[PDB]
Every structure is written in C-alpha cells, then in structure tokens.
Design an enzyme around this catalytic site. Sequence first.
Site, PDB file in Angstrom:
ATOM      1  N   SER B 102       0.852  -1.197   0.000  1.00 31.79           N
ATOM      2  CA  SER B 102       0.000   0.000   0.000  1.00 31.79           C
ATOM      3  C   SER B 102       0.890   1.250   0.000  1.00 31.79           C
ATOM      4  CB  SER B 102      -1.009  -0.041   1.181  1.00 31.79           C
ATOM      5  OG  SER B 102      -1.965   1.006   1.158  1.00 31.79           O
ATOM      6  N   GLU B 126       1.380  -3.931  -4.499  1.00 35.62           N
ATOM      7  CA  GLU B 126       0.187  -3.129  -4.734  1.00 35.62           C
ATOM      8  C   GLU B 126       0.394  -1.650  -4.375  1.00 35.62           C
ATOM      9  OE1 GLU B 126      -3.474  -4.934  -3.381  1.00 35.62           O
ATOM     10  OE2 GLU B 126      -3.290  -6.602  -4.748  1.00 35.62           O
ATOM     11  N   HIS B 242      -4.824  -7.655  -0.919  1.00 40.45           N
ATOM     12  CA  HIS B 242      -3.989  -6.653  -0.296  1.00 40.45           C
ATOM     13  C   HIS B 242      -3.051  -7.058   0.818  1.00 40.45           C
ATOM     14  CE1 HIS B 242      -3.414  -2.550  -1.392  1.00 40.45           C
ATOM     15  NE2 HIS B 242      -3.451  -2.121  -0.150  1.00 40.45           N
TER      16      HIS B 242
END
Lengths: 268, 270
Positions: B102, B126, B242
């Site tokens: 993230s 990600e 995630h």
Amino acid sequence: MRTRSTISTPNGITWYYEQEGTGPDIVLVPDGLGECQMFDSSVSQIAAQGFRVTTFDMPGMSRSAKAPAETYTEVTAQKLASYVISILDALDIKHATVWGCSSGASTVVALLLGYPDRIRNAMCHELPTKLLDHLSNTAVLEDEEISNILANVMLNDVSGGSEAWQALGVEVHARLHKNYPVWARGYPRTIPPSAPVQDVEALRGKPLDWTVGAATPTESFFDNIVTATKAGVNIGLLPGMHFPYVSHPDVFAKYVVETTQKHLWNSS
Amino acid sequence: MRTRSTISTPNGITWYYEQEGTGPDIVLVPDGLGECQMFDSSVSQIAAQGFRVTTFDMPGMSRSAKAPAETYTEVTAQKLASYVISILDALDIKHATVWGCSSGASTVVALLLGYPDRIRNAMCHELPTKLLDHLSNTAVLEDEEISNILANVMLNDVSGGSEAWQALGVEVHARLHKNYPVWARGYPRTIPPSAPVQDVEALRGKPLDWTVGAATPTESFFDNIVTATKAGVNIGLLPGMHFPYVSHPDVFAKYVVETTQKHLWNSSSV
C-alpha cells in the site's frame, strides 16, 4: 433487416451465421461456447454506424453442430483460424476487422499473424495461455454433471453479471447446456498451449488491440498484460469480466466501433 | 526470543518496534494502517532462515502514536522514507532488505531510489498510483462513521480472506479502529500523487521485485503491471489480495526469504 441463414464449407461444416448492415466488414468471433446470440444486442448498434457485422456459431456448437468430429475435438487456435477463413471465403469477406474472446481471442491473433492480408485489425479479449487443471478434469465426467458444473461456473464465476447472463433466455441456456460437454472435451486442454503469443516479436507493430475484464481476478489474465506490454500492443480494460458483450453490451459495441474507426483512419 | 520495545528518533517519533533473529537485515514496512502485529506469524519463520527481521508501527498509528502532526497528515512516500531511515539509523541497520505494501510499497521504492547505499533490495506490493475518490470522501466525516465504513471495507473488499483477518483479534481491531480516521485524513489524497514510479527509466536495473494480489480485481493495480514490465522489473503474484502476510502468511514468508536469498547471491564482487 438482419440476415439469419446457413452456409456450408468444403471442410464439412454447416455454419449458422447472422449478418447485418453494409460497409467495411466486422466479424464477431464467439468464445469456446460458440454462441452468437450473445452478440445479438450489439450487432444492430455496430452495423448502424456504417459497417457490415457478421457473426456465427462455432463448429460443433449449438446451431453450427453439423460438422466432423475433428472440428470440435483437440481444438487449437490454428484450426479455428482456418475454419474462420473458410466461412469468410464462403461469404466473400476479403478484408475484415475481427473481435475474439476466450478461444476466440486466440483465433483472431492466429488470424492476424497467419493471414495478414485478410485481417484489417484484431481485438482479442482475455486470451487463455495457462492450463487450468480444474477445467481439464471435467472432460472425463458424464455429460449432465459437466453441464451442471459449468453452467454454475459461467453464472456466478465469470459472467461478470448474473442478471445479464440469465436474461439471455431459456432457449440460449438450452443450447449452452448441450455445448458444455462438447467444449469441455475439446477446448481447455488443447487451446492454451496453442496460443500464438509465445513469440513476442511477431506481435510488435501489428494492428492489435488487447483487452482484459476489469472485474476479473488479476491472476487469470496477468500474462496478457505482461505479453502485450512487452510487444508494445495497446492493452486496456473493459468492464465486467469474461463476457463484455453480454454484461456491458453498449460499452462493448462502442469499443468495437471506435477501435475499427481508428484503424480505418490509419489506412493511408 | 523476540524483542518488543520502543525507541525515539530526532524527528519526534516514539516508535514501537519488534525484532528477531540474527543475519542480514529484513525490514517489514506496514501499510497505511500501520500495524506490525499483522506480520507476527511470518516474522518468526523469516528470522529462522538466518535473518534479523525488524518491523514497527508507523507514526501516529497504533503503538507509535506519539509523534508530531506532520508525520500523519499530508503523508507522502518521500516523508515516510525519511521516517523509516531514522529508525534504521536508531537501531543501527546500515544495510537492509525492505518489504512494503500500500503506502508502504510507495515508501520502499522511495527508499531504494533515494537511499541506494542503504537498501539491498525492495519488495513492493500493490503500490497505489491513482486517486480513489470514494476513499478521499471519507476524510470529511465523523470518526465513528469512518471506522465503521473502513473496517467493513478491509474485511470484505481488500482483506483477501475474512477468516484470517478476523482472527487477528480484538486488541488488533481495537488499534485499527483508532487508526482508520487518522489514515483517512492523512494518506489517500496525498499518497498516490507521490508515487516514485512516474519516471520509468529510474526503475530500470534496480534491485526491485514487484507483486500484486492474485484475487484482486484487474483494474485495481493494472498500472503496476504495465509500469513494472516497461521498466524490466520482476513482476509476480502472491495469493490473496492486499494483505498477503495476513491471508497467506506461509507463502508470504517463503517469498520474502527466497527473494532476499536471490539478491544476496547477486552480490558477487570482483
């Protein structure tokens, strides 16, 4: 206004096909399931912008079933490309734009590389390159167990919208019910190895526009995005998952028209 | 045999950190939520293969909450990179491998490009580059409405497995409940523009290993796969979405070890 008829080719296949409009040719190649009724909505919209839209059921599936066993067993991208060329020769479509998804995506790229004189441009969507073992293992089962398993998979798993999928009707799902066993035995084991995307340098500079479903899991067609980017091919996303024409027919129909108009401009 | 403690740096941040094992350093940078308890399972497994695994709660989040307002408001990848360098200077970690997801993914790439002498290799997962409007609009709401909305988002939308996520426990979700409003106001508006992946040629040749969640929708991090392939960076998949370290901790822990061992091999000097 739309033509709906049959035509026979030298290879032994009696094709069911549909045709509408006049202008430059756009050919809508279906998926492995081989049902052209999924294109029904978008065919009239695409043809109304000055195009002759052709589509047909694939050999051995649904209405195009009257064919030899060769055409729907141990199926490859190169075999399907030769069968598409035969119907285009039969209908006298000398130059055309081609849409393709699933096994159809492998076919249109095989059409572009194999027969460059005949293809203006190609539009592949979610070309399968990996052997999924859970799809290969269904081939050995009985026919009714395959159809019940795969019909549930298409609904919930990859349709990209159950409601749209359902709304195709009972007559279409009745034809799909018979196709699932024919597809399961022929397609999933032999199609992914025959993908013509192994050679990256063959794809560079070709009039190719690649797409992947926006809601689809990343692992499913991660390799398409890597292969397309290496070759410098236009890669983009379409809403829904596997069947944009079914889930988002207006966005699909717009994409087919806008892409074809862009390549018609480049011809000078 | 695992150290759990706190430490203070000149920038004003009192860090909560954890540390285990000896060998080459591997630093597990958390996400925007800033919770290092999510790494708990994999820290012992990674450290057992001959590595010193370090991890810590991020400024203003959870146990590292005592910090200036600058550190958790209008947060960027370059700011977070300087804060990570400070704790590595405090713990005397001169050379290290870095994991990030993230906002953490943006941080580790900022660490690699900004401080190449200090980073052996980076592992981004990600990295957000697009401004998601539905996350930006939560910042203006009350604190309890943000926490209830975002806790549901993490569970269903991005966890990659509810059962695993839920199993983190009451104490972890209580700390996450306080972090959601602090994250919402600081991170989602200012983080994606500060991604250091705009320059593609800066990334070429660098020891970088990019990953994306396998179950994640294609549109979410489609840009990562395009940007990584253009730069010639290794791009792959981890299971789940995630939080691989939460959903699939064994596969995460194996990936961190195998990737670090590959870059340790490449250090072969004449």
